[PDB]
Amino acid sequence: VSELAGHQTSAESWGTGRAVARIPRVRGGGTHRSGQGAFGNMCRGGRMFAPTKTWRRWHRRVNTTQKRYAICSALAASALPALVMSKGHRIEEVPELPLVVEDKVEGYKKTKEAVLLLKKLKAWNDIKKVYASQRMRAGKGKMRNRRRIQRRGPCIIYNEDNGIIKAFRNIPGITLLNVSKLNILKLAPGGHVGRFCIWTESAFRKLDELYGTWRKAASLKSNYNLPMHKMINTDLSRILKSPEIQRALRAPRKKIHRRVLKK
């Protein structure tokens, strides 16, 4: 808010022997404003309590290792059909979920052939879901230029932009991402992992250089290596049912002993 707001009044308190509250009152006469309360957060036309200020620390810094971690988690989750469908991405006729297309897509020039590619990849149902979800936002966002809202569609991750950006970019829901500049705000759109992603082949081949293997470090980040697992085998049912685990267990106590009525 304006730092001058509510404090342009020259008002002063009337004292205490005049049967009115000791709030400052506007000086003078001849107007409705005269004798009215001022400067208080409880006063109409006064100053708000603790006025908001521009030095509010709007920004946060996150460690580069944690930001790299989140990209790795987002990419790994976008390879599992259960997680992508739980985002709601209509990947039912998609032939393979780490969906990779040839490099010819990077040189597309028309929106017509971008649409045709998505239809033949069976990714057009995700676009139709974005169309169905175009509605008006509820609230004051309409007055503040955020009038339309819609769903997020697939993410096209390319390596070299030879017109692919312009061929897309008129399809609602499509966001295009350079593989060298991956964004967590686009890969996990609402903070939830599992966005549908379509990879160009050159982008797909470049992931092992960008983030590395566990055998070799990344060749494009100069100190980064893939994070380790604190649990190698997450198949809990397989572990519990394994004969070595079952050999060490005592027999289950599956009889319920309810309260005995004392006769």
Partner 1 sequence: MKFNPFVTSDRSKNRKRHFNAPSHIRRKIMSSPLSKELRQKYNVRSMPIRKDDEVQVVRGHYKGQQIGKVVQVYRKKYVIYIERVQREKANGTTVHVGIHPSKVVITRLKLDKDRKKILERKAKSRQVGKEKGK
Site string (60-99) toward RNA, x via CB under 7 A = xxxxxxxxxx-----------------xxxx---------
Burial of 16 from C-beta contacts in 10 A (0-12 / 13-18 / 19+): exposed
User: Does residue 112 bind partner 1 (CB under 8 A)?
Assistant: no
Q: How far apart are CA 230 and CA 249, in angstroms?
A: 25
Residues 6+ apart with CB under 8 A from 65: 224
For residue 32, what are the CA distances in angstroms to 7, 13, 47, 79, 234? 18, 17, 19, 68, 74
Question: 76, 107, 142, 213: which one contacts RNA (CB under 7 A)?
Answer: 142
**Binding track, positions 132-151, relative to partner 1; x by CB under 8 A:** -----------x-x-x----
Residue 34, SS3 per DSSP? coil
Q: Does 31 bind RNA (CB under 7 A)?
A: yes
Nearest to 226 by CA among 210, 206, 205: 210
Nearest CB to partner 1, comparing residues 109 and 241: 109
Among the listed residues 24, 84, 94, 212, the single contact to RNA using CB under 7 A: 24
Q: Which of 82, 249, 251, 256 binds RNA (CB under 7 A)?
A: 256
**Residue with smaller CB distance to RNA, 100 or 184:** 184
Binding RNA (rule: CB under 7 A), the pick from 157, 189, 198, 212 is 189
How far apart are alpha carbons 40 and 35 in whole angstroms? 14
Site of interaction with partner 1 (CB under 8 A) = 143, 145, 147
